[PDB]
């Protein structure tokens, strides 16, 4: 849940692999794109509520 | 005798330099640890919520 600890972006899982004198992690991340603009409001008034 | 005096001076100065280098190495290790902690805090508390 901590940001920028395993990979860059939201985290899904990881797989380890061995090395001659170490370990190599393969992290699977998730990255959004293809945005829009829209228009927003914080709340909606109706019947005084 | 000049070889003897120069040898004494050289070995003393070399020992002092070695001690200084060792102290610098220890300080560098400590500073590296502190900077790693600072980088972790900056990356996790600023770009997100803890």
The answer to whether the CB of A45 falls within 8 A of the CB of A24 is no
Pairwise CA distance, residues B30 & A45, whole Å: 58
Using H for helix, E for strand and C for coil, what is the string for chain B?
CHHHHHHHHHHHHHHHHHHHHHHHHHHHHHHHHHHHHHHHHHHHHCCCCC
Contacts of A7 (CB under 8 A, 6+ apart): A27, A28, A29
Pairwise CA distance, residues B7 & B9, whole Å: 6
Q: How far is CA B49 from CA A3, A4, A12, B22, in A?
A: 8, 12, 19, 40
C-alpha distance from B22 to closest chain A C-alpha (Å) = 27
Task: Write down the experimental method used for this entry.
Answer: cryo-EM
The answer to whether the CB of A9 falls within 8 A of the CB of A31 is yes
Helix, strand and coil content of chain A, in percent to the nearest 5, comes to 0, 40, 60
**Which DSSP symbol is given to A24?**
E
- Record the resolution, in angstroms: 3.5
C-alpha distance from B40 to closest chain A C-alpha (Å) = 9
């Amino acid at each position: 849940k901590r940001v920028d600890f395993c990979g860059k972006g939201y985290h899904l899982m990881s797989f380890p692999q061995s090395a001659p004198h170490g370990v190599v992690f393969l992290h699977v991340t998730y990255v959004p794109a293809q945005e829009k603009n829209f228009t927003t409001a914080p709340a909606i008034c109706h019947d005084g509520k | 005798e000049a070889e003897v005096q120069i040898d004494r001076l050289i070995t003393g100065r070399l020992q002092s330099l070695q001690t200084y280098v060792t102290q610098q190495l220890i300080r560098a290790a400590e500073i590296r640890a502190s900077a790693n902690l600072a980088a972790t805090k900056m990356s996790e508390c600023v770009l997100g919520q803890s």
